[PDB]
Amino acid sequence: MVRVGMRAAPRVSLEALKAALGGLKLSEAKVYLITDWQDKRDQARYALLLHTGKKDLLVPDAFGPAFPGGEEALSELVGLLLAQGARRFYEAVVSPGEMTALLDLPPEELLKRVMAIANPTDPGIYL
Amino acid sequence: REGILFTTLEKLVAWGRSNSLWPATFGLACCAIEMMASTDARNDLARFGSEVFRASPRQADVMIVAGRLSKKMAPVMRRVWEQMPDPKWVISMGACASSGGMFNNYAIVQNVDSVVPVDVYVPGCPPRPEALIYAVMQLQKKVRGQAYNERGERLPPVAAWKRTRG
Amino acid sequence: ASSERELYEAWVELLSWMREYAQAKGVRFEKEADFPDFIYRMERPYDLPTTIMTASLSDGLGEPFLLADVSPRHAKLKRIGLRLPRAHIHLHAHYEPGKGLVTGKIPLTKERFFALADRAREALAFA
Amino acid sequence: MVRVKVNDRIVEVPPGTSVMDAVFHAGYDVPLFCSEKHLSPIGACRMCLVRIGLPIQWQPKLAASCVTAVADGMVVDTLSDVVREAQAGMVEFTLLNHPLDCPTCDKGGACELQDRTVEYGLYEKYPLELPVYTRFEFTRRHVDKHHPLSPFVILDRERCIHCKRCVRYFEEVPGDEVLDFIERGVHTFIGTMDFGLPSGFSGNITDICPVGALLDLTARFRARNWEMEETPTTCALCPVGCGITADTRSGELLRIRAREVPEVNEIWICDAGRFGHEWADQNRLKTPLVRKEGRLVEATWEEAFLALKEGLKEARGEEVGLYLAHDATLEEGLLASELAKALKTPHLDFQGRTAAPASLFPPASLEDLLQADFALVLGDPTEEAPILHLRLSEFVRDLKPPHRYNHGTPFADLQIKERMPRRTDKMALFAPYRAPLMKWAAIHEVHRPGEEREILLALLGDKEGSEMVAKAKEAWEKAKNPVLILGAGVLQDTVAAERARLLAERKGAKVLAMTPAANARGLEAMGVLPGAKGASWDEPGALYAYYGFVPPEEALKGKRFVVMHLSHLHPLAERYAHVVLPAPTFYEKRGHLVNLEGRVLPLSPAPIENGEAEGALQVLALLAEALGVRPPFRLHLEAQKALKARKVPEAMGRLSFRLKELRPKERKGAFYLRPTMWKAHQAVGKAQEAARAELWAHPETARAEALPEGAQVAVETPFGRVEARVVHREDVPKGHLYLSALGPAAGLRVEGRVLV
Amino acid sequence: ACPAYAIYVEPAENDPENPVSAGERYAKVYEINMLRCIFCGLCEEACPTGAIVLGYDFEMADYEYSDLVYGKEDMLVDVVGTKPQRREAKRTGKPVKVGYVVPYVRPELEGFKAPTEGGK
Amino acid sequence: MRLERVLEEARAKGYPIEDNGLGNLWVVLPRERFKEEMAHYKAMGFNFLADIVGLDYLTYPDPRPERFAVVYELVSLPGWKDGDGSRFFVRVYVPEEDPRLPTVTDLWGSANFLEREVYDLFGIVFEGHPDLRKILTPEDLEGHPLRKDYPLGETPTLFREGRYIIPAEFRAALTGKDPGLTFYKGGSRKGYRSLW
Amino acid sequence: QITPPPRHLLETSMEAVIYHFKHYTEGFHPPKGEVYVPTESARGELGYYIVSDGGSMPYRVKVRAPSFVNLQSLPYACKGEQVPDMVAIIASLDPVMGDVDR
């Protein structure tokens, strides 16, 4: 599993993911948006885990309106996922204290946890 | 044209829609049976305008998600909602629908607002049929523009009017 | 018998005396404990005039030099007790009808209690 | 070994075993209130009662398994109807006077009284009989309630079940009898005429008390026992690294408790480490700050990294300083090492680096100290390495590591008797003042600063010392397996440290080196020390510098660019720093440390509110980008790979690393920085007065210098300006002023002046 | 005792000058997420002081997730109505009318005022 | 009457017989003898196949032979042609790295959906099944939920101002392998049973 | 150990308070063992196979679902039947998907 970007750097994370994704087809990939506080999205932060099935890609909690330009970064990100043909979007709810260590767990544990906790979501709520 | 752009016409059409609210039940669990009780001959949601009940989704404005929404049912309910006419509203009935409820696990969606734009929430396990009527009057006066939250804000008539569907 | 009511009344009376001595001498008074039969009474009725079971006079250091307690509403052999900590001194007051509050046979007057408290303060109080 | 049978099972068990431990070693259970691990069992609660046969020859009356020895081929019965009936009756006698506080009791879900009650009480008497909970229908004992014994400890004398745990501990383990019963009969209650609770280990009675009598004032009324999230980690306040458990709920730190690891700290924590948590969760920095208009402004991480790129664009790689904190993890130390390897710079260092590396000396294990014959000590264990006081309390009583049962540490060690006599001939101590442990140091001499080197010369034998020093020399000679213990005075003076090395090499003897830095030996093992040029953590040599701590103002003064990675906000940064960044505390960190005994220790992250903080690992990774160099470490997993490549053993593994190089520095002796247990950044909340600064002076020199016994005197050091209460002590050598070193700057001699 | 884990209780020490509860401890923060709450009554069943007791109001349907986490001062016996009902009565100036009637209120609800069978 | 002959037949061939004093009976057959033995059981007149229940003993305080254990329930209807009413369980342990077991679908068509369920929840593969398809867990679900190595997947509960609850750290109840909040658990909280 | 103490004497007995507190927080610990009991509901045979490990929470609970085992006979039952009757034959079999899916 790869980890790109850095926390609280929305545009750096967005550009790093733009470069790293390339021409990868996301028709069978699963996009996990990791966040806290289900209800309040105005101050929410977001991390991303991209489970392609053959390899996974991690981006730390650097998206969302919680950071300057992070809202537009999340919108562009989800828009690009949809453009690349991603259909399966999920929203994972972790505790604020978890969110940091969860990206420091080993890949298999982190991915099993995310797949267990993820909720099917309308990507439109991030557009 | 969405019921807008004239002071009298929009209030009139909102009146019309509010009283003509057409429920389409999406029964999942025991919340669905407690909603079936909201139609019997003790307390009927058959007076305000909800007498008729068209199983088709092309024919109703109100989508009432009644029960626990399993993650395997989420895309089905998603597409049933997308396959509705556009002036449409969403009620989330019961704890399992509103939040994860007492079933906090891999199987159940922890907020139906994740998949569908929810208009009204109604707690309870099950929520009483009269609480559901309170919710539909709540939605009624919401589409009348008579609804406010605890913060003082007026609420838009139609949620799912604010989302980039795709 | 019905002595209980006047016993709790005189208990409130003794508490009033303790508060007055505290305010006069500028020494700390403390309500130590309330009645469990009033805390944990949920719907159950409470007829006692006050809900306070234990009180104390503590010196400047907070270590008590005088302790006073009353038996709960439901206990057998009801009494009121006094204790000088560190002095191995214990007193047991009852209530005799017509006479008043008595330690054994000796009437327990406010003046008696004031003299006992002053001696206790001067001897036991550290600061 | 001795052959025992518990109710259906057969057990091998060492001879000195307690019957209770043989019971639990067989896997059975029995009430337990009076006895405690590492404490002398004495039958007080009378809860451990079992049946014993030694033939079928049953004993007449029930044996207290806590204070009953085991005999070869002995039968022990814990399931008899009579045994369980007596257990229930004793539980009732214990519950006789209890105050009915369970719902409002801070002891909550974990109350030994509650649990043994629900385990063993209300025996099945023989239908649908209506049973009675309580037969006692009289007035319960009502005594003083919720009495603060100290800024950290509260006392409920009603909840006390009159076991012996707290007074037993106070007499045995710390050796401070500051708690005892007053009256007798049922009027017995805990009290003291020593009110402050002087012992620096008082807080453990809170963990020991099986009831809610002794509770933690710093965590009173915060949450119930089950509700708290437990983060097991290690304390990085000093290099002994006790295991601790950080209780956290809803993003805030509530309470610190001990984590048992008999290898180093048994079940004990020091008061400073345990109650000095108020600062971590109260006021700290959450946003990176950048200097724009001669002042600091909150900025995005992007804007701060932009300022970083700009300020380092014109920077040459041999003027950049890399200065880490005393608690810096092995990963961070190794990443700094590798990054200054690639980026050639001669000066990197860490906050508490000593003139003489601790890696000079062979680390000793605490059980090696228990088995050792002699202990030669220079420094103050109580303030420099607190729990060394407790391991020396075990040592002094001839105690030795117990046998390891199936339930782990023995519940009742027959090796530990009550009121044990303490030997004064087993060790020698030399401190600049009359240290508390001198009570147990027959051979003891109060010397002055900079005299250690001469005591060690005398111990080597190239000259002749005082009576005490010659006695210490002689005892060390006679010692077959002695342990030498060295503090900051030794570790900060090149010549003294070298003479210690010589002594402990000539006689085969291990060393316990009390570094002012927590991960000093691990950072040394990771190669974090300055080079030839040598701008150290206290030296203003570099032109660009990164700081993971607060330097002397003279180190900041002059530099072109300084980037400080702190957790709290310091004025010294809003007047000299250009870019500040938030850092997480060791409570919420994850990584490894190296014990002063060479053992690697894990830091698990606690769910405390960090803000947007980032580890120094990521900070250095991002700082290298502005310089062009690519860092080898970004994450904990890659850091662990490269660590294990660096051949640092598994956790609880001991790390072997020596070093032979000395960096000497002159010491301007006018003021002394007294090594303190309490640390400056801990002076928050209830630790406010406990972590105060002190200035100690001999009454004559104080009188000459006009220093009253109660005065709050301000003092100016190169390390800043601090106010300190003035204490007169007749054991402090004349002509000196001992100033409280409440940081990892202990043991340093500095100029200065008393401001008025 | 909450199977849905819907109750958050932050405690604090009673102030002798102006006390709140009967012991040395009271409810500083008492929140219940009605959307998580499954309505057992186990909270009352574990209530040793009879503080928490299920009531009779059912007209609690509301629009926002974050508004359905009821606080202490939304549940005290003194309050008459549900959150939307009270909000409507304030933005309306028309007093709250509950949509229920009962023969009587249980003793555990002592203080809870309700319309009873026609007693009023 | 047919149960007595089952006990007599199992005891003679060295099949362990587990019994609780509550009235429940097991007959544990080895992996080899499982298929043919239960075929013989159906031949003995066991009309009805009630349940196929899979068990993951990973987190059990006492150890067991293998991690997984499958338990079948066989019955003979009392009101049918010649109904005794004899009902009993057959337990068969299954290795962690060999999640194989022959189906009895050919014997009872009841085992069809039950064995599909056991395959869904545990990685237990049933040999000879007409269709082993995931029944209950979502089509895209990865793994087998009910084996203890699979997380329950809880979501935190939410309140007003940063106040949240994590159930796994909020739970006061203890499991069998949970030591408890005191130094140990004994007595009732290491297991309790009343004497009727 | 099974039943919480009577709520009226929660203000009198230490044993009552302790047992109330412990019971409502931790609960109680049944013996180590597996158990099952059958019952007749309006949809057939019902039962719980309970493995308890001596803890306060059950080690595992499996439910025999009559609505689940009854559904294996649906393709057979409605085999050859009418298309409108495929709904009536499902309604007549009395299914409950809360029981089936579970």
Ligand code: SF4
């Ligand atoms: S909230 Fe209660 S009634 Fe509604 S579906 Fe969930 S369990 Fe059934």
Ligand code: SF4
């Ligand atoms: S000390 Fe234990 S038994 Fe006593 S009130 Fe506290 S929790 Fe209850």
Ligand code: SF4
């Ligand atoms: S205060 Fe606690 S530890 Fe001390 S004797 Fe009493 S019950 Fe034992």
Ligand code: SF4
């Ligand atoms: S400061 Fe040192 S002695 Fe105290 S808890 Fe921390 S590691 Fe242990």
Ligand code: SF4
């Ligand atoms: S009724 Fe009480 S115990 Fe039950 S879910 Fe609601 S708050 Fe929790």
Ligand code: FES
């Ligand atoms: S008497 Fe207290 S445990 Fe032995």
